Every structure is written in C-alpha cells, then in structure tokens.
Amino acid sequence: SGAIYVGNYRVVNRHLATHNDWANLVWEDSSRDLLVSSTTAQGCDTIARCDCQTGVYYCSSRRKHYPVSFSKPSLIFVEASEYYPARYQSHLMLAVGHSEPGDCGGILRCQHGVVGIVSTGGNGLVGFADVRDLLWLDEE
Ligand SMILES: NS(=O)(=O)c1cnc2cccnn12
Ligand SMILES: NS(=O)(=O)c1cnc2cccnn12
Ligand SMILES: [Zn+2]
C-alpha cells in the first residue's frame, strides 16, 4: 500500500484505489496502474521534475529503504501478478530489487522529490510507475 499526497491530490496504484478514490476521481490510466483522486487537506510530498536514474525506494516487505539505479519510463511486458494478468504496462521504470504485491505504493525518491510508486515485482526486479511527466500534479 501507499500513496503520494501532492497539493489536493492523492496518487495511488489504480489496482488499490478505493470506492472513495473512484467517487472523487481526477484521472486514471490502467496501462500505467495509476489513479489520482481529490483530498480536503493539502499533502506533504513534492514531485521530482528530472531524468534521474538513481534514487531510493521503500520496500514494506523488508521494512527497508533501498538505494537503486532504475531505467527511464518505458512500455514493458509484465508477467502475471496476484492483482494483474501478464500484460504491457506504460511509463514503467525497472530496478534490481525486492518487490512483492503488498509493496505497491512504496515511494521512489531522488534528490528532486518523489519519482514514482512501486507497481510491479517478481524475478528480483521492482517496477515503479513514473509520475514525473504529470506536470498538472503541481497546480490547480
Ligand atoms: N529491517 S527493519 O528493522 O526495518 C525490520 C525488518 N523486519 C521488521 C519487523 C518490524 C520492524 N522492523 N523490521
Ligand atoms: N514509500 S513511503 O516512504 O511513503 C513509506 C514509508 N513507510 C511506508 C509504509 C507503507 C507505505 N509506504 N511507506
Ligand atoms: Zn531527480
């Protein structure tokens, strides 16, 4: 689990979005596993605007933050998970690291702020859904 809280926006994995998230929907993309909903109180997180390929992610299944190198956001084939079938996911970054289904929502962060959230796992890789292209998160 986990979300990004930026302004009056809540960024979550689409597959973990709640009824309240859908009832307060701003934007969702199944191909990216992202959903954004509205908040009443303002959030504590800042979005990275950058092309960093190094950062740190939170892994709930180790209760540890790991420094990782990660690929730039691409269209990647993902094998079947407890929450998705084998399919192609867009705006996905991969790193070598531990990721189980419950680790989805963990933040990846660089020196500029929040890069993305854990979205995929298996075979010793962790995949993160990028949010740095979503400039509209910073306003309105
Ligand atoms: N490496 S860690 O201390 O962050 C850790 C590993 N396993 C647990 C269980 C509870 C709390 N912390 N914890
Ligand atoms: N990725 S994070 O910095 O927001 C984080 C730190 N500790 C937890 C526990 C659950 C979800 N997320 N989380
Ligand atoms: Zn950065």
Swiss-Prot record:
Active site: H15 (for protease 2a activity), D33 (for protease 2a activity), C104 (for protease 2a activity)
Catalytic activity: Selective cleavage of Tyr-|-Gly bond in the picornavirus polyprotein
Superkingdom assignment: Viruses
Transmembrane spans: none
Sections of the chain in a coiled coil: none
Residues that hold Zn(2+) 1 according to the record: C50, C52, C110, H112
Subunit structure: Homodimer.
Described function: Cysteine protease that cleaves viral polyprotein and specific host proteins. It is responsible for the autocatalytic cleavage between the P1 and P2 regions, which is the first cleavage occurring in the polyprotein. Also cleaves the host translation initiation factor EIF4G1, in order to shut down the capped cellular mRNA translation. Inhibits the host nucleus-cytoplasm protein and RNA trafficking by cleaving host members of the nuclear pores. Counteracts stress granule formation probably by antagonizing its assembly or promoting its dissassembly.
Protein name: Protease 2A
Native source organism of the sequence: Coxsackievirus A16 (strain G-10)
Lineage, highest ranks first: Viruses, Riboviria, Orthornavirae, Pisuviricota, Pisoniviricetes
Full-protein residues shown: 869 to 1008 of 2193
